Coordinates of C-alpha atoms and ligand atoms in Angstrom, one line a residue:
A218 CA -0.1 -23.0 -24.1
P219 CA -0.2 -19.2 -24.4
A220 CA -2.4 -20.0 -27.4
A221 CA -4.3 -22.8 -25.5
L222 CA -5.3 -20.0 -23.2
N223 CA -5.8 -17.2 -25.7
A224 CA -8.2 -19.4 -27.6
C225 CA -10.3 -20.2 -24.5
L226 CA -10.4 -16.5 -23.8
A227 CA -11.8 -15.6 -27.2
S228 CA -14.2 -18.6 -27.1
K229 CA -15.8 -16.8 -24.1
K230 CA -15.2 -13.4 -25.9
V231 CA -12.9 -12.3 -23.0
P232 CA -10.9 -9.4 -24.5
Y233 CA -7.2 -10.5 -24.6
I234 CA -4.0 -8.9 -25.8
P235 CA -2.4 -10.8 -28.7
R236 CA 0.9 -12.4 -27.8
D237 CA 4.1 -10.6 -28.8
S238 CA 2.2 -7.7 -30.3
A239 CA 3.1 -4.1 -29.9
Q240 CA 0.6 -3.8 -27.1
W241 CA 1.9 -6.9 -25.5
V242 CA 5.3 -5.3 -25.2
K243 CA 3.8 -2.2 -23.7
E244 CA 1.6 -4.1 -21.2
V245 CA 4.4 -6.5 -20.0
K246 CA 6.6 -3.6 -19.0
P247 CA 6.3 -3.6 -15.2
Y248 CA 6.1 -0.4 -13.0
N249 CA 9.3 -1.5 -11.2
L250 CA 11.6 -2.1 -14.2
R251 CA 13.9 -4.2 -11.9
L252 CA 11.4 -7.1 -12.0
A253 CA 9.8 -8.0 -15.3
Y254 CA 7.8 -11.1 -16.2
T255 CA 6.1 -12.6 -19.2
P256 CA 2.5 -13.8 -18.8
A257 CA 1.1 -16.9 -20.5
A258 CA -1.7 -14.6 -21.5
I259 CA -3.0 -11.1 -20.6
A260 CA -6.8 -10.5 -20.3
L261 CA -8.1 -7.0 -20.6
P262 CA -11.7 -7.2 -19.2
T263 CA -14.2 -4.4 -19.0
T264 CA -17.0 -6.4 -17.3
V265 CA -17.3 -8.6 -14.3
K266 CA -18.3 -11.4 -16.6
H267 CA -15.0 -11.2 -18.6
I268 CA -13.2 -11.7 -15.3
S269 CA -15.3 -14.7 -14.4
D270 CA -14.8 -16.2 -17.8
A271 CA -11.1 -15.3 -17.7
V272 CA -10.8 -17.0 -14.3
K273 CA -12.5 -20.1 -15.6
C274 CA -10.2 -20.1 -18.6
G275 CA -7.4 -20.1 -16.0
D276 CA -8.7 -23.1 -14.1
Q277 CA -9.2 -25.0 -17.4
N278 CA -5.5 -24.6 -18.5
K279 CA -4.0 -25.2 -15.0
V280 CA -2.4 -21.8 -15.0
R281 CA -1.9 -19.7 -11.9
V282 CA -3.8 -16.4 -12.4
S283 CA -3.0 -13.0 -11.0
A284 CA -4.8 -9.6 -11.2
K285 CA -3.1 -6.3 -11.9
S286 CA -4.9 -3.0 -11.3
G287 CA -2.4 -0.1 -11.1
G288 CA 0.8 -2.2 -11.3
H289 CA 2.6 -0.4 -8.5
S290 CA 3.6 -3.7 -6.8
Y291 CA 7.1 -3.2 -5.5
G292 CA 7.8 -6.7 -6.8
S293 CA 5.5 -6.7 -9.9
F294 CA 3.2 -9.3 -8.3
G295 CA 0.5 -8.0 -10.5
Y296 CA 2.0 -10.3 -13.1
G297 CA 2.4 -13.1 -10.5
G298 CA 6.0 -12.7 -9.3
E299 CA 7.0 -15.2 -12.1
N300 CA 6.3 -16.2 -15.7
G301 CA 3.5 -18.3 -16.9
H302 CA 0.4 -16.7 -15.3
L303 CA -2.8 -15.6 -16.9
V304 CA -2.8 -11.9 -15.9
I305 CA -6.2 -10.2 -15.7
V306 CA -5.6 -6.4 -16.2
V307 CA -8.6 -4.7 -14.7
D308 CA -7.1 -1.3 -15.5
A309 CA -9.9 -0.7 -18.1
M310 CA -12.6 -1.0 -15.4
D311 CA -12.3 2.3 -13.6
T312 CA -15.9 3.7 -13.2
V313 CA -16.5 5.6 -10.0
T314 CA -20.0 6.1 -8.7
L315 CA -21.0 8.2 -5.7
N316 CA -24.3 7.3 -4.1
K317 CA -26.6 9.7 -2.2
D318 CA -26.1 8.0 1.2
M319 CA -22.3 8.8 0.6
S320 CA -21.3 5.2 -0.1
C321 CA -19.4 4.8 -3.4
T322 CA -18.8 2.0 -5.9
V323 CA -15.2 2.1 -7.4
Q324 CA -14.4 -0.4 -10.1
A325 CA -11.2 -2.4 -9.4
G326 CA -9.1 -0.6 -12.0
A327 CA -9.6 3.0 -10.9
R328 CA -6.3 4.7 -9.9
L329 CA -6.3 6.7 -6.7
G330 CA -6.1 10.1 -8.4
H331 CA -9.1 9.2 -10.6
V332 CA -11.0 8.2 -7.5
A333 CA -10.3 11.5 -5.7
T334 CA -11.0 13.5 -8.8
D335 CA -14.4 11.9 -9.4
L336 CA -15.5 11.8 -5.8
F337 CA -14.7 15.5 -5.2
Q338 CA -16.6 16.4 -8.4
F339 CA -19.5 14.0 -8.2
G340 CA -20.1 15.6 -4.7
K341 CA -17.4 16.8 -2.5
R342 CA -16.4 13.4 -1.1
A343 CA -13.2 11.5 -0.6
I344 CA -11.7 8.4 0.9
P345 CA -8.4 8.1 2.7
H346 CA -5.5 6.8 0.5
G347 CA -1.9 7.4 -0.3
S348 CA 0.0 10.2 -2.1
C349 CA 0.7 8.5 -5.4
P350 CA -2.2 9.1 -7.8
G351 CA -1.2 6.3 -10.2
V352 CA -1.6 3.6 -7.6
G353 CA -4.5 1.2 -8.4
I354 CA -7.4 1.1 -5.9
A355 CA -7.5 -2.7 -5.7
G356 CA -3.9 -3.4 -4.6
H357 CA -3.9 -0.3 -2.4
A358 CA -7.1 -1.1 -0.4
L359 CA -6.8 -4.9 -0.3
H360 CA -3.6 -4.5 1.8
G361 CA -4.2 -1.2 3.7
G362 CA -3.9 2.2 2.1
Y363 CA -2.1 4.8 4.1
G364 CA -1.6 8.5 3.3
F365 CA -1.8 12.0 4.7
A366 CA -5.5 11.6 5.6
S367 CA -5.1 8.2 7.3
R368 CA -4.4 9.5 10.8
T369 CA -7.6 11.5 10.6
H370 CA -9.9 9.3 8.5
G371 CA -8.2 5.8 8.6
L372 CA -6.7 3.4 6.2
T373 CA -8.4 3.0 2.9
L374 CA -9.6 -0.4 4.0
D375 CA -11.1 1.1 7.2
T376 CA -13.8 2.7 5.0
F377 CA -14.2 -0.6 3.0
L378 CA -17.8 -1.8 2.7
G379 CA -17.5 -4.8 0.4
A380 CA -16.6 -5.9 -3.1
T381 CA -17.9 -7.9 -6.0
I382 CA -15.2 -10.6 -6.2
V383 CA -14.6 -13.7 -8.5
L384 CA -13.5 -16.8 -6.6
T385 CA -11.1 -19.3 -8.1
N386 CA -14.0 -21.4 -9.5
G387 CA -15.4 -18.4 -11.4
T388 CA -18.4 -17.9 -9.1
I389 CA -19.1 -14.2 -8.6
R390 CA -19.8 -13.1 -5.0
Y391 CA -20.6 -9.8 -3.4
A392 CA -18.6 -10.0 -0.2
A393 CA -19.7 -8.0 2.8
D394 CA -19.6 -8.4 6.6
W395 CA -23.1 -9.9 6.8
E396 CA -23.1 -12.3 3.9
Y397 CA -19.4 -13.4 4.1
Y398 CA -17.8 -12.2 7.4
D399 CA -14.5 -14.1 7.1
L400 CA -14.0 -13.5 3.3
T401 CA -14.6 -9.8 3.9
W402 CA -12.2 -10.0 6.9
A403 CA -9.5 -11.3 4.6
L404 CA -10.2 -8.7 1.9
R405 CA -9.5 -6.0 4.5
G406 CA -5.7 -6.7 4.5
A407 CA -4.8 -9.7 2.3
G408 CA -7.4 -9.9 -0.4
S409 CA -4.8 -10.4 -3.2
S410 CA -4.7 -14.1 -2.3
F411 CA -8.4 -14.9 -2.4
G412 CA -10.0 -13.8 -5.6
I413 CA -10.2 -11.2 -8.4
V414 CA -12.1 -8.2 -7.2
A415 CA -14.0 -6.2 -9.8
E416 CA -15.7 -3.4 -7.8
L417 CA -14.9 -2.1 -4.3
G418 CA -17.3 -0.2 -2.0
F419 CA -16.3 2.5 0.4
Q420 CA -18.1 5.0 2.8
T421 CA -16.7 8.4 1.8
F422 CA -16.1 11.4 4.1
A423 CA -16.6 15.0 3.2
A424 CA -13.6 16.5 1.4
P425 CA -12.3 19.2 3.7
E426 CA -12.2 22.8 2.4
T427 CA -9.4 24.0 4.7
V428 CA -6.2 22.0 4.4
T429 CA -2.7 23.1 5.3
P430 CA 0.3 21.2 3.9
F431 CA 3.6 21.9 5.7
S432 CA 7.3 21.1 5.6
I433 CA 10.1 21.5 8.2
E434 CA 13.6 21.3 6.8
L435 CA 16.4 20.0 9.1
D436 CA 20.0 19.0 9.0
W437 CA 20.5 16.6 12.0
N438 CA 23.8 15.1 13.2
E439 CA 23.8 11.6 14.7
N440 CA 23.0 12.8 18.2
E441 CA 20.5 15.4 17.1
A442 CA 18.7 12.5 15.3
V443 CA 18.5 10.3 18.4
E444 CA 16.8 13.2 20.2
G445 CA 14.7 14.4 17.3
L446 CA 13.3 10.9 16.5
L447 CA 12.6 10.3 20.2
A448 CA 10.8 13.6 20.4
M449 CA 8.7 12.6 17.4
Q450 CA 7.6 9.3 19.0
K451 CA 6.2 11.4 22.0
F452 CA 4.5 13.8 19.6
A453 CA 3.0 10.9 17.7
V454 CA 1.1 9.9 20.9
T455 CA -0.2 13.3 21.8
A456 CA -0.8 15.3 18.6
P457 CA -4.4 16.0 17.5
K458 CA -6.0 13.7 15.0
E459 CA -6.3 16.6 12.5
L460 CA -2.5 16.3 12.2
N461 CA -0.8 14.0 9.7
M462 CA 3.0 13.7 9.6
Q463 CA 6.0 11.8 8.2
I464 CA 9.7 12.5 8.2
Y465 CA 11.8 12.0 5.1
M466 CA 15.4 11.1 5.9
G467 CA 17.9 11.1 3.1
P468 CA 21.7 11.0 2.7
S469 CA 22.1 14.8 3.0
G470 CA 19.3 15.9 5.3
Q471 CA 15.8 15.5 6.7
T472 CA 12.4 17.0 6.1
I473 CA 9.4 16.7 8.4
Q474 CA 6.3 17.1 6.2
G475 CA 2.6 16.5 6.5
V476 CA -0.9 17.8 6.4
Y477 CA -3.1 19.5 9.0
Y478 CA -6.8 19.7 8.2
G479 CA -7.3 23.1 9.7
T480 CA -5.9 26.6 9.7
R481 CA -2.3 27.7 9.7
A482 CA -2.6 29.3 13.2
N483 CA -4.1 26.0 14.5
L484 CA -1.3 24.0 12.9
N485 CA 1.2 26.3 14.7
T486 CA -0.3 25.4 18.1
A487 CA -0.3 21.7 17.3
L488 CA 3.4 21.7 16.3
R489 CA 4.6 23.9 19.1
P490 CA 5.5 21.0 21.5
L491 CA 7.4 19.1 18.8
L492 CA 9.1 22.2 17.3
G493 CA 10.2 23.1 20.9
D494 CA 12.0 19.7 21.3
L495 CA 13.5 20.1 17.8
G496 CA 14.5 23.7 17.9
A497 CA 13.0 24.1 14.4
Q498 CA 10.5 26.1 12.6
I499 CA 8.1 25.7 9.7
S500 CA 9.9 26.1 6.3
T501 CA 6.9 26.2 4.0
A502 CA 3.2 26.2 4.9
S503 CA 0.1 27.1 2.8
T504 CA -3.6 26.7 3.1
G505 CA -5.8 25.6 0.3
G506 CA -8.3 23.1 -1.1
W507 CA -8.3 19.3 -0.7
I508 CA -7.4 18.7 -4.4
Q509 CA -4.6 21.2 -4.0
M510 CA -3.0 19.2 -1.2
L511 CA -3.3 16.0 -3.2
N512 CA -1.5 17.7 -6.1
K513 CA 1.2 19.1 -3.9
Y514 CA 2.1 15.6 -2.7
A515 CA 1.5 13.8 -6.1
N516 CA 5.2 14.3 -7.0
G517 CA 4.5 16.0 -10.3
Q518 CA 1.9 13.4 -11.5
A519 CA -1.5 14.7 -12.6
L520 CA -4.2 13.4 -10.3
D521 CA -6.8 12.0 -12.8
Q522 CA -4.6 9.1 -13.8
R523 CA -6.2 6.6 -16.2
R524 CA -5.4 4.1 -19.0
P525 CA -3.1 4.1 -20.8
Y526 CA -0.5 4.3 -18.0
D527 CA 3.2 4.3 -18.7
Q528 CA 5.0 5.2 -15.4
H529 CA 8.1 3.2 -14.4
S530 CA 10.9 3.2 -11.9
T531 CA 13.6 0.7 -10.9
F532 CA 14.0 0.4 -7.2
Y533 CA 14.1 -1.9 -4.2
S534 CA 12.2 -1.1 -0.9
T535 CA 11.3 -2.5 2.5
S536 CA 9.2 -1.4 5.5
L537 CA 8.7 -1.7 9.2
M538 CA 5.6 -1.5 11.4
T539 CA 7.3 -0.7 14.8
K540 CA 6.1 0.3 18.2
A541 CA 7.9 3.2 20.0
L542 CA 11.6 2.5 19.8
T543 CA 13.7 2.6 22.9
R544 CA 16.5 5.1 23.4
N545 CA 19.1 2.5 22.5
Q546 CA 17.1 1.3 19.5
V547 CA 17.0 4.9 18.1
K548 CA 20.7 5.2 18.7
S549 CA 21.5 2.0 16.8
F550 CA 19.5 3.2 13.8
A551 CA 21.2 6.7 13.8
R552 CA 24.7 5.2 14.2
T553 CA 24.2 2.8 11.2
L554 CA 22.6 5.6 9.1
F555 CA 25.1 8.4 9.8
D556 CA 27.8 5.8 9.4
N557 CA 26.5 5.4 5.8
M558 CA 25.8 9.1 5.4
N559 CA 29.3 10.2 6.3
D560 CA 31.0 7.5 4.2
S561 CA 32.0 9.0 0.8
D562 CA 32.2 5.6 -0.7
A563 CA 28.9 4.0 0.6
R564 CA 25.7 3.7 -1.4
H565 CA 23.8 7.0 -1.0
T566 CA 20.9 6.3 -3.5
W567 CA 18.3 5.7 -0.7
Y568 CA 15.8 7.5 1.4
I569 CA 13.5 6.7 4.4
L570 CA 9.9 7.7 5.2
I571 CA 8.7 7.3 8.8
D572 CA 5.0 8.0 9.0
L573 CA 3.3 8.7 12.3
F574 CA 0.9 5.8 12.1
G575 CA -0.9 4.9 15.3
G576 CA -1.5 5.9 18.9
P577 CA -4.6 7.1 20.8
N578 CA -5.3 10.0 18.4
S579 CA -4.9 8.0 15.2
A580 CA -8.1 6.8 13.5
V581 CA -6.3 3.6 12.5
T582 CA -5.6 2.4 16.0
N583 CA -9.3 1.7 17.0
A584 CA -10.9 1.6 13.6
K585 CA -14.5 0.3 13.9
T586 CA -17.1 -1.5 11.8
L587 CA -18.8 1.2 9.8
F588 CA -21.9 2.8 11.4
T589 CA -20.9 1.0 14.7
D590 CA -19.0 1.5 17.9
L591 CA -17.6 -2.2 17.6
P592 CA -14.1 -3.0 16.2
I593 CA -13.5 -3.4 12.5
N594 CA -13.6 -6.9 11.0
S595 CA -10.1 -6.8 9.4
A596 CA -7.1 -9.1 9.1
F597 CA -4.7 -6.2 9.1
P598 CA -2.6 -6.8 12.3
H599 CA -0.7 -3.6 12.9
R600 CA -3.2 -1.2 14.5
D601 CA -1.2 -1.6 17.7
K602 CA 1.9 -0.3 15.9
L603 CA 3.0 3.4 16.1
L604 CA 5.4 4.0 13.3
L605 CA 5.3 3.0 9.6
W606 CA 8.8 2.9 8.2
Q607 CA 9.6 2.7 4.5
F608 CA 13.2 2.1 3.2
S609 CA 13.8 2.8 -0.5
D610 CA 16.7 2.7 -2.8
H611 CA 16.6 4.0 -6.4
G612 CA 20.2 3.2 -7.6
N613 CA 21.9 0.7 -9.8
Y614 CA 20.5 -2.9 -9.9
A615 CA 22.0 -4.4 -13.0
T616 CA 25.6 -4.7 -11.7
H617 CA 25.3 -3.8 -8.0
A618 CA 21.8 -5.0 -7.0
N619 CA 23.1 -6.8 -3.9
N620 CA 24.6 -3.6 -2.6
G621 CA 21.1 -2.1 -2.9
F622 CA 19.6 -5.1 -0.9
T623 CA 22.4 -5.0 1.8
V624 CA 22.1 -1.3 2.7
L625 CA 18.3 -1.3 3.2
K626 CA 18.4 -4.5 5.2
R627 CA 21.3 -3.1 7.3
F628 CA 19.1 -0.1 8.1
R629 CA 16.0 -2.2 8.8
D630 CA 17.9 -4.6 11.1
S631 CA 19.6 -1.7 13.0
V632 CA 16.0 -0.9 14.2
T633 CA 14.7 -4.4 15.1
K634 CA 17.8 -6.1 16.6
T635 CA 16.9 -5.3 20.2
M636 CA 13.1 -5.5 19.7
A637 CA 11.1 -8.5 20.9
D638 CA 10.7 -10.8 17.8
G639 CA 6.9 -10.4 17.9
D640 CA 6.7 -6.6 18.6
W641 CA 7.3 -5.4 15.0
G642 CA 5.9 -6.3 11.6
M643 CA 6.0 -5.1 8.0
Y644 CA 3.6 -3.5 5.6
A645 CA 2.3 -5.6 2.6
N646 CA 1.8 -2.6 0.3
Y647 CA 5.5 -1.8 0.9
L648 CA 6.4 -5.5 0.4
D649 CA 10.0 -6.5 0.9
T650 CA 10.7 -8.6 -2.2
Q651 CA 13.7 -10.4 -0.8
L652 CA 11.7 -12.1 2.0
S653 CA 10.9 -15.8 2.3
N654 CA 7.1 -16.6 2.1
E655 CA 7.3 -17.7 5.7
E656 CA 9.0 -14.5 6.9
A657 CA 6.9 -12.2 4.7
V658 CA 3.5 -13.5 5.7
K659 CA 4.6 -13.6 9.3
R660 CA 5.4 -9.9 9.2
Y661 CA 2.6 -8.5 7.0
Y662 CA -0.2 -10.5 8.5
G663 CA 1.0 -11.4 12.0
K664 CA -1.5 -13.4 14.1
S665 CA -4.0 -13.4 11.3
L666 CA -2.0 -16.0 9.4
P667 CA -3.7 -19.2 10.7
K668 CA -7.2 -18.0 10.0
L669 CA -6.0 -16.7 6.6
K670 CA -4.4 -20.0 5.8
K671 CA -7.6 -21.8 6.9
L672 CA -9.7 -19.5 4.6
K673 CA -7.3 -19.9 1.7
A674 CA -7.8 -23.7 1.8
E675 CA -11.6 -23.1 1.7
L676 CA -11.6 -20.8 -1.3
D677 CA -8.4 -21.4 -3.3
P678 CA -7.1 -24.8 -2.3
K679 CA -5.1 -25.4 -5.5
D680 CA -3.6 -22.0 -5.0
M681 CA -4.6 -20.6 -8.3
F682 CA -4.2 -17.0 -7.1
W683 CA -0.5 -17.4 -6.4
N684 CA 2.2 -14.9 -5.7
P685 CA 5.7 -15.2 -4.1
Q686 CA 4.5 -13.8 -0.7
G687 CA 0.9 -15.0 -1.0
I688 CA -1.1 -16.8 1.6
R689 CA -0.4 -20.6 1.3
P690 CA -3.4 -22.9 1.8
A691 CA -3.3 -25.1 4.9
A692 CA -2.6 -28.7 4.0
Ligands
FAD148 C1 4.3 2.8 -6.9 C2 3.8 3.5 -5.7 C3 3.2 2.8 -4.6 C4 2.8 3.5 -3.5 C5 2.9 4.9 -3.4 N1 2.5 5.6 -2.3 C6 2.0 4.9 -1.3 C7 1.5 5.6 -0.2 O1 1.6 6.8 0.0 N2 0.9 4.8 0.8 C8 0.8 3.4 0.8 O2 0.3 2.8 1.7 N3 1.2 2.7 -0.3 C9 1.8 3.4 -1.3 N4 2.2 2.8 -2.4 C10 2.1 1.3 -2.5 C11 0.7 0.8 -3.0 O3 -0.3 0.9 -1.9 C12 0.9 -0.7 -3.3 O4 1.9 -0.8 -4.3 C13 -0.4 -1.3 -3.9 O5 -0.6 -2.6 -3.4 C14 -0.3 -1.4 -5.4 O6 -1.6 -1.6 -6.0 P1 -1.8 -1.6 -7.6 O7 -1.6 -0.2 -8.1 O8 -3.2 -2.2 -7.9 O9 -0.6 -2.6 -8.0 P2 -0.8 -4.0 -8.6 O10 0.6 -4.5 -9.0 O11 -1.7 -4.0 -9.8 O12 -1.4 -4.9 -7.4 C15 -0.6 -5.2 -6.2 C16 -1.2 -6.4 -5.6 O13 -2.7 -6.3 -5.6 C17 -3.2 -7.4 -6.3 N5 -4.4 -7.0 -7.1 C18 -4.5 -5.9 -8.0 N6 -5.6 -5.8 -8.5 C19 -6.4 -6.8 -8.0 C20 -7.7 -7.2 -8.1 N7 -8.6 -6.6 -8.9 N8 -8.2 -8.2 -7.4 C21 -7.3 -8.8 -6.6 N9 -6.0 -8.6 -6.3 C22 -5.6 -7.5 -7.1 C23 -2.1 -7.9 -7.2 O14 -2.3 -9.3 -7.5 C24 -0.9 -7.7 -6.3 O15 -0.8 -8.8 -5.3 C25 3.5 5.5 -4.5 C26 3.9 4.9 -5.6 C27 4.6 5.7 -6.7
LIG149 C1 -17.1 -21.7 -5.6 O1 -16.4 -21.8 -4.3 C2 -17.1 -21.2 -3.3 C3 -16.2 -21.3 -2.1 O2 -15.5 -22.5 -2.0 C4 -18.4 -21.9 -3.0 O3 -19.1 -21.1 -2.1 C5 -19.4 -21.8 -0.8 O4 -20.5 -22.7 -1.0 C6 -21.0 -23.4 0.2 C7 -22.0 -24.4 -0.3 O5 -22.7 -23.9 -1.5 C8 -21.6 -22.3 1.0 O6 -22.3 -22.8 2.2 C9 -21.5 -23.0 3.4 O7 -21.3 -24.3 3.7 C10 -22.2 -24.9 4.6 C11 -22.2 -26.4 4.4 O8 -23.0 -27.1 5.4 C12 -23.6 -24.3 4.3 O9 -24.6 -25.0 5.0 C13 -23.6 -22.9 4.7 O10 -24.6 -22.2 4.0 C14 -22.2 -22.2 4.5 O11 -22.5 -20.9 4.2 C15 -20.5 -21.3 1.4 O12 -21.0 -20.2 2.2 C16 -19.8 -20.7 0.1 N1 -18.7 -19.8 0.5 C17 -18.4 -18.7 -0.2 C18 -17.3 -17.9 0.3 O13 -19.1 -18.4 -1.2 C19 -19.2 -21.9 -4.3 O14 -20.4 -22.7 -4.1 C20 -18.4 -22.5 -5.5 N2 -19.1 -22.3 -6.7 C21 -19.7 -23.4 -7.3 C22 -20.4 -23.1 -8.6 O15 -19.7 -24.5 -6.9

């Protein structure tokens, strides 16, 4: 069957990786080493036509098919979340092209750092995206794309124009608001479930020349954390849009860190109200170029990431997309966390990232259709949320994997217990792997689910493009 496929692929001269070869062992290695899988075949296209033929060779052999770009799926859904998929690795298609009207064409395999590197050097242009340079553009944008430029310039999908996409029947479409309003609407948030994208289009913004990263180091106690976090909610509503912030919380201390697109002295005035509530001061702050800021937050990884790519970790993570927590909700989180922090025996191999996500001064909250003053056509449901939580654990998962799952869930639940069941969601790019399809799609996609399920039945009724937390077609 792996050879039933592999033969079809080479009948259409779709480049494929030979089974159980040296390259097959290097390509089947997931990013998250905790979850590995074994394709039925791996395709390695370099043209849109390869993808189309590869998708047709998938329909022929009744295999589910799944696309992998960067491979940073927290559950290795690039491979399909299971064995026996045809896996179309678009990593080799990474050409960036900057047009004169400031739109760009980015092939579906480009990694974020290769996108910023080529956009700043082809002109001085950029799109908003996350901090990790090795992340693939396809998975990042089709589900959101948040980083230290988002509060100022929006999610990556907010700048999304359209994409050449291969539907389950092999037909190649260019999807944009005019020609395919609903398909493009699904691609802005949940496009992993609807086709194999080969090229994405975005409207770039001018890479700023004056950018100030900053950190504020802290060591809260439980009650200094109920106050400090409540003070940050208020600041998330009022701070200028030039300001981008998150707070790392770990087992031994905290660090408020972010980026202000402006001068140091202006950052000082923006932070004054929050630092007053906190009783804290900037620890490190420096002004420099835009590529400098992306390198400072790349976590040691060189920006211009390309193929071949061999980064790996073994971890479990989850997220939250909350509104402003109440006093008592922040107290439940800090009681449960410092309960863990002060316990010498408990699992301490975790950390938490709380981005300031929405509010009146965030560009995500009222993102618009490009070149318009009308709302954006996007299935992404969380523009009304204020805070983007991420819970991670990078400890042991061979022998004590269920301790890793318990501790992050105990943290996440401590936040949501008192919250109205439909006032909080979760973030698909930070997908919680332990979730039932019903729960996951409820939380990632919210009130877009029915329209998404209606559209899934239109386009992929046999559910070829399958993954554990994918959109299921309506019966
Ligand atoms: C590993 C990692 C992930 C990060 C990091 N930093 C982030 C940040 O600062 N902000 C964020 O908002 N997210 C951050 N993420 C998470 C990434 O955004 C997500 O993990 C991306 O979804 C991963 O994308 P990619 O690198 O392409 O991973 P894949 O496993 O290849 O794909 C995931 C998902 O997308 C589908 N898909 C991929 N390629 C296609 C194409 N061409 N067409 C359709 N669908 C595609 C896959 O099927 C799968 O469902 C920091 C780090 C270190
Ligand atoms: C592969 O599948 C896609 C999606 O299932 C097919 O595209 C869809 O095709 C229909 C008809 O060709 C398009 O027309 C739509 O339906 C009504 C029917 O009355 C038509 O009058 C309208 O023009 C309306 O647009 C539809 O738009 C189109 N959808 C998409 C997303 O492309 C495609 O035809 C299939 N490929 C092959 C080779 O059959």
